[PDB]
Write a protein that binds this ligand. Structure first.
Ligand SMILES: [Mg+2]
Ligand SMILES: [Mg+2]
Ligand SMILES: [Mg+2]
Ligand SMILES: [Mg+2]
Ligand SMILES: [Mg+2]
Ligand SMILES: [Zn+2]
Ligand SMILES: [Zn+2]
Lengths: 80, 118, 157, 146, 42, 140, 148, 37, 205
RNA sequence: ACCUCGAUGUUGGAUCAGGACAUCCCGAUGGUGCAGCCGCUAUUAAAGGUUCGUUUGUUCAACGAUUAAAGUCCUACGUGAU
RNA sequence: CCCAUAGUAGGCCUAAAAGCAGCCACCAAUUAAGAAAGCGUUCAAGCUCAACACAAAAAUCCCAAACAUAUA
């Protein structure tokens, strides 16, 4: 992992999937070992971007997805 | 088609056929699955043998029993045939065998939530 | 064998039949019924008072922080007059309708951390949040006027 | 039903979802089975009923989603196991001895080498006890053990 | 699998089990005798 | 990592209670005790003082100190060197509510100790409970 | 480099108290076999063993079996050997039992109790039907201090 | 494995699974906890 | 003295005269110490049996070790071993009179409380070791609170009142319906079919 | 004290062994206070194997020397119309 | 399923035993939390309670054959 950006619009219809996602994985309890990552939360249907400096950009439209699905996708991508 | 018999329950694994060769250590116990793989006629033959009356006519009767593992039957036997008995068990249909009309005729039981992976 | 034995003595078959015949038969309760059709009040009064005490309100998701980092954040917020709160959605969802906050229902779900105040130091709070690139600000409602994040930014500036 | 599609970018799209047939015979019921009057009237071979609670790969669906009673969820799960072991769901598969009414997984039962005396015989289970309360159309009760 | 001693007499006997037929027979007799009680009560 | 110590300002080099416990992470005991003595000079001398040292991963010292301890402080205010045995019935010194308030005035000010409660009740009740756990009776 | 272990020598077996009878001699006399002696325990040196790290808990010497009928004696308990590094001092509570230095140097750390006597042991012209059944004497049990 | 008539989880990672007809307590962290019914 | 008192092996003054093995003292429901007295929890005897001094020691040690002396207190609800079981020699041909006393033991009937706990503590806090002791006991036993005891009793009356079986053991035995008194014991008229030997069938109405 | 007192002594040994597995060795596994070797423990496994001598009538036992091991048992304490 | 700020290592005796060798009180802050309910530390340190928040085995060789649903 190199960088991650979380964006969502609770001003519009809420999407708890990405909210739980950022509450869980975007926490220092994980970043302490995953120090290589840089998290940013730019909030304004949602969108979670993950930039890997090697060759990968991951874009998650976590509108109909849920926290477990997106967490598993993120873990699988990290494993690569 | 005695090769294609079906056992209810776990009889294929639990039913054990016991024989003795007569010699010491000659006790052989073989599950139904193993016996079926060895002889595709043995299971039906033994069932009939056990159901027949235990007298001297039993083996004469068993001479009138003709067991064939598959659809093939000798020509003379086929020419002898007179009637076909209805199968005792009606074979349940698979989904692959059900017609789309029948599927439609059967009602849907529940409303699945739209937001579900399935 | 004696009438009393260490093992359970075999009953006369007649006695066994008697027992079987006189075994208990439970009733059938008709069609299967299943298949058939003061901290709480302390929180109530405390939140009722808080909704009037506060003039500006905001909410965040301060769960991704550590114990020490949360303590430091609390210290920086107490430097000002603002106070940080948390309360169950289980009791807050009734509170929104109790205080007539219809637009606030789809804002509080999950971990929610209120930021009740009367004096906006939101400029410096946002500056502090900037060096920690997470924990985004969430919508609130100052004096019964719902503000989005852009509203809070404009109010700060 | 939402499905996840990949291209890397992955997204979830909600597709067409069936609805309960109109006019349930018994509206306002706990479970779908009770709503449709099927409490004791389905067996392992009723694939049309069973598949409605089955993941595409054969697994059962959770009780919260299905709405079934606890007892009816257990019955459906066991009937589905039996149907799978009988080969009645050839398409609901992850990717030769004919059986039916198989309670146990074939690979977990040991042969009955020593069936006991007549008064303590070791019997071979057939079907499931969960269906003991089904509708009885026969003069003698259907035997769960052979 | 043998029962020690002689069957049906000793401390250890063949387990005997009640069939539904036996239960029904006993219940039939009991019903007859309940009617006997009624007819002897007057 | 945070290291918590309750050392006495009077004796800056007791030995085992600092040496082995601090040497596991890798420390400069000379610098540590020099800074501790600097704080001892800054404050009254001869009193237990909690520390809030944080051994950074870069091998640097950032000592943080505040008010002295509370048990020893209350015992001294009550004129007690060693506390009571039972502490439920035993008592040796009596502290008045006015004295409790006067000492509490200079208690709710430290940052590390987190005793930053605005209300006076939060602190007075806490110190009263501490005294009650100790062998000190609260007069009036 | 220092260890305390507990040994427990085997307890002798208990004699039997039977009487023999056979078709033409109904009173065949005492028929109880003696019990077997308990198994000794022994410490032995090994150059392979470096230290007392691979030590264990109460080393229980095997107990001789009891006497049987037909005057069958009981097998004596098997000898249990414990192993220690070369140059191990073995002490009891102060008393030094042995300084085991040489390869294979071995010392008996706990004897096994003598087995009990069956009633036939007490047979004599005077005593024609003894019933006495001496139990197996216990074996020495002690704690050992091991230091290199 | 240790054979037990009653299976008891010992640590947090001890999990019960019914395999090949009988219950087992498996444990990744402490394989000493392995139990078989 | 909030601790369980030590029980002697045998009475100080023994019985010179040997007494017969009246198994009736184990057979049938218990009429004594069937109710709680200054306590909240206890060990209920779901069957009849004889409590040896070994059982007494097991109970005492386990309870004393696994209770809080200051809060939890215990009391014996059973007398000390007083019935001599004149077990004879370790081999001898039958006859020669009656044997001599070797052990002392106290009879217990079903429904009898054996040990009664009390003090400031709830039932689940005590269920564990009381259930272990109950299992250790020589007869069927159960860790029962006052609430659970009353609950199971009320359940028993519920069964007796709601059973749909027209035929009850009481009805048949008392009326001698099928001549079954030729097979029953005279004690069955009062045990109502719920007691067989020293065994008590709670499940049976 | 239930069968046998209207020609069956018994124990050991010899010969030949059939069987159980509650396994002594050989086989496959889990754990270990198993680094390796080693043991200890448990699951599974009965196809095969399971010594020779001194004293003693001895079964046993002790002792000597071995062995992969020198298993626990049942078979009318297997087997004397061998 | 979560995760556990801080008065303080509450004192007493205890080299120190701080929650844990033990007595006695068992208060307390934020919104919210038992000066100890279990591991593990000479003592500390590291982990979980919660609450925040959402049955079976014996010796010649197993022992009818089989069967789940056709009307009582
Ligand atoms: Mg017989
Ligand atoms: Mg007689
Ligand atoms: Mg003759
Ligand atoms: Mg085995
Ligand atoms: Mg014999
Ligand atoms: Zn229902
Ligand atoms: Zn574990």
């Amino acid at each position: 992992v190199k960088q991650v950006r979380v964006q969502f619009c609770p001003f519009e219809k809420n999407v708890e999937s990405t909210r739980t996602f950022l509450q869980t994985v975007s926490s220092e309890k994980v970043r302490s070992t995953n120090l290589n990552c840089s998290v940013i939360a730019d909030v304004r249907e949602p969108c979670v971007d993950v930039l890997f400096g090697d060759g990968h950009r991951l874009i998650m439209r976590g509108a109909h997805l849920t926290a477990l699905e997106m967490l598993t996708a993120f873990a699988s991508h990290i494993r690569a | 088609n005695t090769r294609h018999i079906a056992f209810s329950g776990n009889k294929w694994e639990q039913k054990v056929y016991s024989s003795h060769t007569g010699y010491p250590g000659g006790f052989r116990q073989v599950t139904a699955a193993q016996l079926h793989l060895r002889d595709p006629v043995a299971i039906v033959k033994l069932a009939i043998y056990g159901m027949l009356p235990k007298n001297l006519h039993r083996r004469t009767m068993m001479e009138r029993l003709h067991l064939f593992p598959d659809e093939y039957i000798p020509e003379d036997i086929l020419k002898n045939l007179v009637e076909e008995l209805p199968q005792p068990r009606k074979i349940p249909k698979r989904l692959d065998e059900y017609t789309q009309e029948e599927i439609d005729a059967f009602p849907r039981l529940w409303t699945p939530p739209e937001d579900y992976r399935l | 064998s004696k009438a009393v034995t260490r093992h359970r003595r075999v009953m006369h078959f007649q006695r066994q039949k008697l027992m079987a015949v006189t075994e208990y038969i439970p009733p059938k309760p008709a069609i299967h019924p299943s298949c058939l059709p003061g901290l709480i009040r302390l929180l109530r009064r405390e939140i009722a008072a808080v909704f009037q005490d506060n003039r500006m309100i905001a909410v965040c998701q301060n769960v991704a922080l550590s114990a020490e980092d949360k303590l430091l954040m609390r210290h920086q917020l107490r430097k000002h007059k603002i106070l940080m709160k948390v309360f169950p959605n289980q009791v807050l969802k009734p509170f929104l309708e109790d205080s007539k906050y219809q637009n606030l229902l789809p804002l509080f779900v999950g971990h929610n951390m209120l930021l009740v105040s009367e004096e906006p130091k939101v400029k410096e709070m946002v500056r502090i949040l900037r060096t920690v690139p997470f924990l985004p600000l969430l919508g609130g409602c100052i004096d019964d006027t719902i503000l989005s994040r852009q509203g809070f930014i404009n109010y700060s500036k | 039903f939402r499905e996840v599609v990949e291209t890397t970018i992955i997204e979830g799209r909600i597709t067409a979802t069936p609805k309960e047939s109109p006019n349930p015979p018994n509206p306002s019921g706990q479970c779908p089975i009770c709503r449709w009057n099927l409490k004791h009237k389905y067996n392992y071979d009723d694939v049309l009923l069973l598949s409605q609670f089955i993941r595409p790969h054969g697994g059962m669906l959770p009780r919260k989603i299905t709405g079934l009673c606890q007892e009816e969820h257990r019955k459906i799960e066991e009937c589905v196991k039996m149907a799978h072991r009988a080969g009645l769901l050839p398409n609901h598969r992850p990717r030769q001895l004919n059986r039916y009414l198989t309670r146990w997984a074939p690979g977990s039962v040991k042969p009955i080498y020593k069936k006991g005396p007549r008064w303590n015989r070791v019997r071979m289970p057939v079907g499931s006890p969960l269906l003991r309360d089904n509708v009885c159309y026969s003069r003698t009760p259907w035997k769960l053990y052979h | 699998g043998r029962i020690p001693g002689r069957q049906w007499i000793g401390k250890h006997r063949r387990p005997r089990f009640v069939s539904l037929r036996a239960k029904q027979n006993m219940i039939r007799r009991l019903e007859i005798e309940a009617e006997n009680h009624y007819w002897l009560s007057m | 990592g945070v290291i918590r110590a309750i050392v006495r300002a009077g004796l800056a080099m007791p030995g085992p209670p600092l040496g082995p416990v601090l040497g596991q992470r890798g420390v400069s005991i000379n610098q540590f005790c020099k800074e501790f003595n600097e704080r001892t000079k800054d404050i009254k001398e001869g009193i237990p003082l909690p520390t809030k040292i944080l051994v950074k991963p870069d091998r640097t010292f950032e000592i943080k100190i505040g008010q002295p301890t509370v048990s020893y402080f209350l015992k001294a205010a009550a004129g007690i060197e060693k506390g009571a045995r039972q502490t439920g019935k035993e008592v040796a010194g009596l502290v008045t509510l006015k004295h409790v308030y006067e000492i509490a005035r200079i208690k709710a000010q430290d940052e590390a100790f987190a005793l930053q409660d605005v209300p006076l009740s939060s602190v007075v009740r806490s110190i009263i409970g501490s005294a009650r756990s100790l062998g000190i009776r609260v007069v009036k | 480099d220092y260890r305390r272990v507990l040994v427990c020598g085997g307890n002798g077996g208990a004699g039997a108290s039977c009487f023999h009878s056979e078709p033409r001699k109904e009173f065949g006399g005492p028929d109880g076999g003696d019990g077997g002696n308990g198994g000794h325990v022994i410490l032995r040196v090994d150059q392979q063993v470096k230290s007392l790290s691979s030590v264990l808990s109460r080393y229980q010497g095997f107990s001789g079996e009891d006497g049987g009928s037909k005057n069958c004696f009981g097998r004596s308990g098997a000898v249990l050997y414990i192993r220690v590094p070369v140059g191990t001092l073995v002490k009891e509570g102060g008393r030094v039992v042995a300084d085991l230095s040489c390869v294979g140097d071995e010392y008996i750390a706990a004897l096994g109790g003598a087995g009990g006597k069956g009633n036939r042991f007490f047979l004599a012209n005077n005593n024609r039907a003894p019933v006495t059944c001496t139990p197996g004497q216990p074996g020495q049990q002690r704690v050992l201090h091991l230091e290199l | 494995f240790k054979n037990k008539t009653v299976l008891k989880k010992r640590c947090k990672d001890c999990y019960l699974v019914k395999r090949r007809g009988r219950w087992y307590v498996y444990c990744k962290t402490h394989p000493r906890h392995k139990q078989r019914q | 003295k909030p601790k369980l008192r030590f029980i002697e092996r045998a009475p100080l003054v023994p019985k010179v005269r040997r007494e017969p093995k009246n198994l009736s003292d184990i057979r049938g429901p218990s009429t004594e110490a069937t109710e709680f007295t200054e306590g909240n929890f206890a060990i209920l005897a779901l069957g009849g049996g004889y409590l040896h001094w070994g059982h007494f020691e097991m109970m005492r040690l386990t309870i004393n070790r696994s209770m809080d002396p200051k809060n939890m207190f215990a009391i014996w609800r059973v007398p000390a071993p007083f019935k001599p079981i004149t077990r004879k020699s370790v081999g001898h041909r039958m006859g020669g009179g009656k044997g001599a006393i070797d052990h002392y033991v106290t009879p217990v009937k079903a429904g009898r409380l054996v040990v009664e706990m009390g003090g400031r503590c709830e039932f689940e806090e005590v269920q564990g070791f009381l259930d272990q002791v109950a299992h250790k006991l020589p007869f069927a036993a159960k860790a029962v609170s006052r609430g659970t005891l009353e609950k199971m009793r009320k359940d028993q009356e519920e069964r007796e009142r709601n059973n749909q079986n027209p035929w009850t053991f009481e009805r048949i035995a008392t009326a001698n319906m099928l001549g079954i008194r030729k097979v029953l014991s005279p004690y069955d008229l009062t045990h109502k079919g719920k007691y067989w030997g020293k065994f008590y069938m709670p499940k049976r109405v």
